[PDB]
């Protein structure tokens, strides 16, 4: 995102009617933190939400 809002004004985007695939960025380990609380970082995507 070219611009990020402050924490008190966190920007929200709704995702619907699409296929969610993030394995491209998950395996790169390009993020300082990838904390998934009470959920597997990859198996959560194998379901319809």
């Amino acid at each position, epitope marked *: 995102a070219t611009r990020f809002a402050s924490v008190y004004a966190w920007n929200r985007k709704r995702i619907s009617n699409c296929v969610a695939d993030y394995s491209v960025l998950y395996n790169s380990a390009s993020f300082s933190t990838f904390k998934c609380y*009470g*959920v*597997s970082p990859t*198996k*959560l995507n*194998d*379901l319809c939400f």
Partner: nanobody
Amino acid sequence: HVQLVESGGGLVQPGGSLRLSCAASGRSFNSYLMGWFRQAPGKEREFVAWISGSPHDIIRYRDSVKDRFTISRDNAKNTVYLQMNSLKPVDTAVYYCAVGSLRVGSFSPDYWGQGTQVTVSS
């Protein structure tokens, strides 16, 4: 239509275990959360526990009952299970089975059953 039917009620000693199960019919509840609530007579119905029907099942419990009244569920049968363990007299109440959806990360009951009396007395 959707109906919830309870079963397994009765009275158990302090420290004696029990199990209450409520089956849900009519529709599917894989996007729902299977849960239980208890209402000690003369008081306001208090949460007990809820469980989601997901590959990464999320479980919540109620402070007074956390880690004691274990909760599980079934997706094929669409039923909620509540395994009560090592009870005390304070646990006497009418237990209701709740079927709801996860709204804003909070278990939001949508459909309710008729309940059942689970009593604990010395």
